[PDB]
Amino acid sequence: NCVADYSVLYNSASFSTFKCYGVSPTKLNDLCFTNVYADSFVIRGDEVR
Amino acid sequence: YRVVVLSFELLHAPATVCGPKKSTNLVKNKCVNFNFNGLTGTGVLTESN
Amino acid sequence: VNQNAQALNTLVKQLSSNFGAISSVLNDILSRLDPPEAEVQIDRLITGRL
């Protein structure tokens, strides 16, 4: 129940990893979804893979 | 390395989160590329009972 | 009449099969994936539907 602007994230150029599966990252602004229950944590770099 | 995973749910139900876009006018009885609630396609629309 | 109707009914229902693709709807793949990745899903639908 809120507007998702994915250009703010995608075009910020701070995020070293942008990996999208099943969806292209440039069309996230185009599709509407039921929900996007996001998750958050802190990990090591070598384990980001 | 700070990590967020965004899992998007694309199911057959009303959408809550949607990308920035502009809703336009509705044309009836004429062949149109249409997008209702994320459902995209091409066809003509008729009033239904 | 029954056999011919069954043959077409089976042909219609095969359109809802994924054949390994992420979605059986061709428009859903095009709206979600870029051509470098949208195509790979489409050949999976083309192979099954052909």
CSV table of C-alpha atoms in Angstrom, one decimal:
chain,number,residue,atom,x,y,z
A,1,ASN,CA,0.0,0.0,0.0
A,2,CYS,CA,2.7,2.5,-1.1
A,3,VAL,CA,4.4,3.8,-4.2
A,4,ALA,CA,7.8,2.1,-5.0
A,5,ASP,CA,10.4,4.1,-6.8
A,6,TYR,CA,13.1,1.7,-7.9
A,7,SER,CA,15.1,4.3,-9.9
A,8,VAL,CA,16.2,5.9,-6.6
A,9,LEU,CA,17.9,2.6,-5.7
A,10,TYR,CA,19.0,1.4,-9.2
A,11,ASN,CA,20.5,4.7,-10.3
A,12,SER,CA,22.1,5.7,-7.0
A,13,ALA,CA,25.5,4.1,-7.9
A,14,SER,CA,26.3,3.2,-4.3
A,15,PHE,CA,25.1,-0.4,-4.3
A,16,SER,CA,27.9,-2.8,-5.4
A,17,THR,CA,25.5,-5.6,-6.1
A,18,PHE,CA,22.3,-5.4,-8.1
A,19,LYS,CA,21.2,-8.9,-9.0
A,20,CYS,CA,17.5,-9.4,-10.1
A,21,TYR,CA,16.1,-12.8,-10.9
A,22,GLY,CA,12.8,-13.3,-12.8
A,23,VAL,CA,12.6,-9.5,-13.3
A,24,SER,CA,14.7,-7.0,-15.2
A,25,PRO,CA,15.9,-4.2,-12.9
A,26,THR,CA,14.9,-1.5,-15.4
A,27,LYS,CA,11.3,-2.6,-15.5
A,28,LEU,CA,10.7,-2.6,-11.7
A,29,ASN,CA,9.0,0.8,-12.1
A,30,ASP,CA,6.6,-0.7,-14.7
A,31,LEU,CA,5.2,-3.8,-13.0
A,32,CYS,CA,2.6,-3.5,-10.1
A,33,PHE,CA,2.9,-6.2,-7.3
A,34,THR,CA,0.7,-7.5,-4.4
A,35,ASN,CA,3.6,-7.0,-1.9
A,36,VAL,CA,7.4,-6.7,-1.6
A,37,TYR,CA,8.2,-7.8,2.0
A,38,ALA,CA,11.8,-6.5,2.0
A,39,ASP,CA,14.6,-8.0,4.2
A,40,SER,CA,17.7,-6.4,5.8
A,41,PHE,CA,21.1,-7.6,7.3
A,42,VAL,CA,24.9,-7.0,7.2
A,43,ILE,CA,27.2,-9.7,5.8
A,44,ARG,CA,30.9,-10.0,4.7
A,45,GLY,CA,31.8,-9.2,1.1
A,46,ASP,CA,33.2,-12.6,0.1
A,47,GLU,CA,29.9,-14.1,1.3
A,48,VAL,CA,27.8,-11.7,-0.8
A,49,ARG,CA,28.2,-14.2,-3.6
B,1,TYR,CA,28.5,-5.2,3.3
B,2,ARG,CA,24.9,-4.2,4.0
B,3,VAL,CA,22.4,-6.4,2.2
B,4,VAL,CA,18.7,-6.0,1.4
B,5,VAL,CA,16.8,-8.7,-0.5
B,6,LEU,CA,13.5,-7.5,-2.1
B,7,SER,CA,11.2,-10.4,-2.9
B,8,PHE,CA,8.3,-9.3,-5.1
B,9,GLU,CA,5.1,-11.3,-5.0
B,10,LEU,CA,3.4,-11.5,-8.5
B,11,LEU,CA,0.1,-13.5,-7.9
B,12,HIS,CA,-3.5,-13.3,-9.2
B,13,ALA,CA,-4.7,-10.7,-6.7
B,14,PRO,CA,-5.1,-6.8,-6.4
B,15,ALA,CA,-1.7,-5.0,-6.3
B,16,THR,CA,-0.6,-2.7,-3.4
B,17,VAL,CA,2.9,-1.5,-4.4
B,18,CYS,CA,3.1,0.0,-8.0
B,19,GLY,CA,5.8,1.8,-10.0
B,20,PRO,CA,5.4,5.6,-10.7
B,21,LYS,CA,3.1,5.8,-13.8
B,22,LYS,CA,0.1,7.9,-15.1
B,23,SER,CA,-3.4,6.4,-15.4
B,24,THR,CA,-5.0,7.5,-18.7
B,25,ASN,CA,-8.6,7.7,-20.1
B,26,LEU,CA,-10.7,4.6,-20.9
B,27,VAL,CA,-11.8,4.0,-24.5
B,28,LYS,CA,-14.6,1.5,-25.2
B,29,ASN,CA,-15.5,-0.5,-28.3
B,30,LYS,CA,-12.1,0.2,-30.1
B,31,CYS,CA,-9.0,-1.9,-30.5
B,32,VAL,CA,-6.6,-0.8,-27.7
B,33,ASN,CA,-3.4,-1.8,-26.0
B,34,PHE,CA,-4.6,-2.0,-22.4
B,35,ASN,CA,-3.1,-2.3,-18.9
B,36,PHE,CA,-5.6,-3.0,-16.1
B,37,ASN,CA,-3.9,-3.4,-12.7
B,38,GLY,CA,-0.7,-4.7,-14.2
B,39,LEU,CA,-2.5,-7.0,-16.7
B,40,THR,CA,-1.2,-5.9,-20.1
B,41,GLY,CA,-2.6,-7.0,-23.5
B,42,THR,CA,-4.2,-5.9,-26.8
B,43,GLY,CA,-7.9,-6.1,-27.6
B,44,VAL,CA,-11.3,-4.3,-27.7
B,45,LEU,CA,-13.4,-3.9,-24.6
B,46,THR,CA,-17.2,-4.2,-24.3
B,47,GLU,CA,-19.6,-3.5,-21.5
B,48,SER,CA,-20.5,-6.8,-19.8
B,49,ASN,CA,-23.7,-7.9,-17.9
C,1,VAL,CA,-17.3,-34.9,-33.6
C,2,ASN,CA,-16.0,-35.8,-30.1
C,3,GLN,CA,-12.5,-36.8,-31.2
C,4,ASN,CA,-12.1,-33.5,-33.2
C,5,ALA,CA,-13.3,-31.5,-30.3
C,6,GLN,CA,-11.0,-33.3,-27.9
C,7,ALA,CA,-8.0,-32.6,-30.2
C,8,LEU,CA,-8.7,-28.9,-30.3
C,9,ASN,CA,-9.5,-28.8,-26.5
C,10,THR,CA,-6.1,-30.4,-25.8
C,11,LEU,CA,-4.4,-27.9,-28.2
C,12,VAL,CA,-6.1,-25.0,-26.3
C,13,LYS,CA,-5.0,-26.3,-22.9
C,14,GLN,CA,-1.4,-26.7,-23.9
C,15,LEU,CA,-1.2,-22.9,-24.1
C,16,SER,CA,-1.3,-22.7,-20.3
C,17,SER,CA,1.8,-24.9,-20.0
C,18,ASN,CA,5.1,-23.4,-19.0
C,19,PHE,CA,7.4,-25.9,-20.8
C,20,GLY,CA,10.1,-24.8,-18.4
C,21,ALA,CA,9.5,-21.1,-18.8
C,22,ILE,CA,8.9,-18.8,-15.9
C,23,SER,CA,5.4,-18.0,-17.1
C,24,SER,CA,3.0,-19.5,-19.7
C,25,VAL,CA,1.8,-16.0,-20.6
C,26,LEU,CA,3.9,-14.5,-23.4
C,27,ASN,CA,2.9,-11.0,-22.5
C,28,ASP,CA,4.0,-11.5,-18.9
C,29,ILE,CA,7.5,-12.5,-20.0
C,30,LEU,CA,7.9,-9.5,-22.3
C,31,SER,CA,6.7,-7.1,-19.6
C,32,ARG,CA,9.1,-8.5,-17.0
C,33,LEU,CA,12.4,-9.4,-18.7
C,34,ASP,CA,14.8,-7.6,-21.1
C,35,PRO,CA,15.3,-9.1,-24.6
C,36,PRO,CA,18.6,-10.8,-23.6
C,37,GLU,CA,16.7,-12.7,-20.9
C,38,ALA,CA,13.1,-12.5,-22.2
C,39,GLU,CA,14.1,-14.4,-25.3
C,40,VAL,CA,15.5,-17.4,-23.4
C,41,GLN,CA,12.1,-17.9,-21.8
C,42,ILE,CA,10.3,-17.4,-25.2
C,43,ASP,CA,12.2,-20.2,-27.0
C,44,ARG,CA,11.0,-22.5,-24.1
C,45,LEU,CA,7.4,-21.5,-24.9
C,46,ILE,CA,8.1,-21.7,-28.7
C,47,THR,CA,9.5,-25.2,-28.4
C,48,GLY,CA,6.6,-26.5,-26.4
C,49,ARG,CA,3.9,-24.8,-28.5
C,50,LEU,CA,5.5,-25.7,-31.8
